[PDB]
Design a protein around this motif. Structure first.
Motif, PDB file in Angstrom:
ATOM      1  N   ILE A  10       2.544  -0.033  -6.305  1.00 38.53           N
ATOM      2  CA  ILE A  10       1.541   0.556  -5.424  1.00 38.53           C
ATOM      3  C   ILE A  10       0.256  -0.252  -5.598  1.00 38.53           C
ATOM      4  N   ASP A  50      -3.132  -0.406  -3.264  1.00 38.15           N
ATOM      5  CA  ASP A  50      -3.792   0.064  -2.049  1.00 38.15           C
ATOM      6  C   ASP A  50      -4.750  -0.959  -1.469  1.00 38.15           C
ATOM      7  N   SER A  51      -5.117  -1.975  -2.253  1.00 38.63           N
ATOM      8  CA  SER A  51      -5.948  -3.087  -1.806  1.00 38.63           C
ATOM      9  C   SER A  51      -5.282  -4.000  -0.776  1.00 38.63           C
ATOM     10  N   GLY A 106       0.815  -1.194   0.000  1.00 36.90           N
ATOM     11  CA  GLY A 106       0.000   0.000   0.000  1.00 36.90           C
ATOM     12  C   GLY A 106       0.850   1.246   0.000  1.00 36.90           C
ATOM     13  N   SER A 107       0.192   2.392  -0.135  1.00 40.76           N
ATOM     14  CA  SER A 107       0.976   3.612  -0.218  1.00 40.76           C
ATOM     15  C   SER A 107       1.615   3.998   1.112  1.00 40.76           C
ATOM     16  N   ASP A 108       1.369   3.279   2.195  1.00 38.81           N
ATOM     17  CA  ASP A 108       2.109   3.506   3.429  1.00 38.81           C
ATOM     18  C   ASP A 108       3.442   2.734   3.464  1.00 38.81           C
TER      19      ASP A 108
END
Ligand SMILES: Nc1nc2c(ncn2[C@@H]2O[C@H](COP(=O)(O)OP(=O)(O)OP(O)(O)=S)[C@@H](O)[C@H]2O)c(=O)[nH]1
Ligand SMILES: O=c1cc(O)c2ccccc2o1
Lengths: 297, 304
Positions: free
Chosen positions: B287, B289-290, B256-258
């Motif tokens: 990337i 995000d799921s 994810g984007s973190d």
């Protein structure tokens, strides 16, 4: 009362082109997929599908004649039929003229769409592709011929780009005309006008142009009237069709500047059909399609 | 964008493709080729081609690879017209039957004649399927390897060492998943890059003419996920303990984007410490995000 347009993809290349038209949302037409090979079937989401297989053009012609009655029933009712075997050779090449002749005997305005392959593809004997065009033009009101070689002049195109470009311009050979008839714009036309320039018209060529920003319609129109796909035949064409697709904010003045330019560029005695199409999905881009038919003695 | 096409051929290859579609693999065109018409009508592929109708009745090649080869060759012009335009073709199949074993080399060779970057992803059958399916898969893999830039071979036997210790359908679902993992692990670098962007040109540089290859996959959540997922991947039984001798390695870390550069880099340090001294190793990120707090490392090892 409004025009009934049926679009027929026959053979692997034709059904695939029709599948691309469906995936890109071409609206306002009935899609028909006709499979001509016994050994394989390309599947399709076309509204209507007919398998007649029961890599040779004679095979494709006999398969289609064997089904002339079924084919005719699918076409019955149409004001306009498009017929293409798309990219590639195969049985579609042979079956296309059969469909076209059925459509024209039914009295539909019959528009063939055919591609000359790139020269780097080789030739497979009988002069097979040249014969396929001649048979199709023998049975079409208008035969739109797309010379794929001229795509290599539209830059430093890669091999993949050349194939993607051929696919896109084939799709436009249908869409640019059908959207003009079926889809509202600021400047709308009569199907009867279109029937007049294309009926019995013979061979046609096409040109396309795109632009954004200031003077987009004139830039795109000038690209289209100058397209290598038109093979410098604009000046002698006796029938000229031009359609401008753009957003609904496109002003009458700017539209008219493009219309005036195609009239200057065309032969003085040419029939000219001009219209526009609202397609708001395009942003500040505008897309011009030009169909040139006929010739000057 | 690069145009990526993924071809599932034969029953298993078509099922893997449906799973790719079900799990949301994006940025690619899915093409299903089979000799059974009713199995292709259940496919969710964008493009679907039924071959060998004369010679099979639409009921498969009866485990005979010559039947599958002739059916694809008979349709070579159609297949070529479907592939035209792609920068990258994947050819995916379960080896050992007739349609996939015989037809995969034809599809691959078309893609290679068009000059597309041509990547095979195929499974070796389980030892319990018998010795003819293993023999046939052996020949099919050798034929396929002649026409692929990279041919990723996944040994189904090693699947049984991973995950839960059940059901025959379950094992084949596992095969479907690892085929997706091999496709996605690569295509996602191109279609949905993260911080470390590895584009089509890079992938083409390391995968062109690379030959036979193996893959490993690993995932983790929570503290030290990226280190964990990397170590599971480089130790994956699918890598057949040969990671450490591989001289070309492609690795993607999806998160994810973190997902921080620090996390990414620590996994990269671990992998290159474990790698061949002279290995070319390319690291990219995805990337996705799921994935939540999950991180997913995929490893492609060639050049042994
Ligand atoms: N990933 C995956 N692999 C499968 C599945 N079913 C079978 N396989 C594997 O693939 C191999 C080939 O099976 P399959 O693809 O169905 O044959 P085929 O290529 O279509 O050959 P056929 O026409 O002679 S029946 C099997 O031996 C098995 O190892 C499946 O559902 N998913
Ligand atoms: O998916 C399909 C199913 C068919 O019955 C068919 C028949 C002819 C042409 C195309 C076709 O596509």
């Amino acid at each position: 009362y409004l025009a009934v347009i049926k679009v027929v993809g026959i053979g692997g290349g034709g059904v695939n082109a029709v599948n691309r038209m469906i995936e890109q949302g071409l609206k306002g037409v009935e899609f028909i997929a006709i499979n001509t090979d016994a050994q394989a079937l390309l599947m399709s989401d076309a509204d209507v599908k007919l398998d007649v297989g029961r890599a040779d053009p004679e095979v494709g012609r006999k398969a289609a004649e064997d089904a002339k009655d079924e084919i005719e029933e699918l076409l019955r009712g149409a004001d306009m039929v498009f017929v293409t075997a798309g990219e590639g050779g195969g049985t579609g090449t042979g079956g296309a003229p059969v469909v076209a002749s059925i459509a024209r005997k039914l009295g539909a305005l019959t528009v063939g769409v055919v591609t000359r392959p790139f020269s780097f593809e080789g030739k497979r004997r009988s002069n097979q592709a040249e014969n396929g065009i001649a048979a199709l033009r023998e049975s079409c009101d208008t035969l739109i011929v797309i010379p794929n070689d001229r795509l290599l002049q539209m830059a430093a195109v890669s091999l993949m780009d050349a194939f993607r470009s051929a696919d896109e311009v084939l799709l436009n050979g249908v869409q640019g005309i059908t959207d003009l008839i079926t889809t509202p714009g600021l400047i709308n036309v009569d199907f009867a006008d279109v029937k007049g320039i294309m009926s019995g018209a013979g061979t046609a060529l096409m040109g396309i142009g795109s632009a954004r920003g200031e003077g987009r319609s004139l830039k795109a129109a000038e690209i289209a009237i100058n397209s290598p796909l038109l093979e410098a035949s604009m000046e002698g064409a006796q029938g000229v069709l031009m359609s401008i697709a753009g957003g609904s904010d496109l002003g009458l003045f700017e539209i008219n500047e493009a219309a005036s330019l195609v009239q200057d560029a065309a032969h003085p005695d040419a029939n000219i059909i001009f219209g526009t199409v609202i397609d708001d999905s395009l942003g500040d881009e505008v897309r011009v399609t030009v169909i040139a038919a006929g010739f000057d003695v």
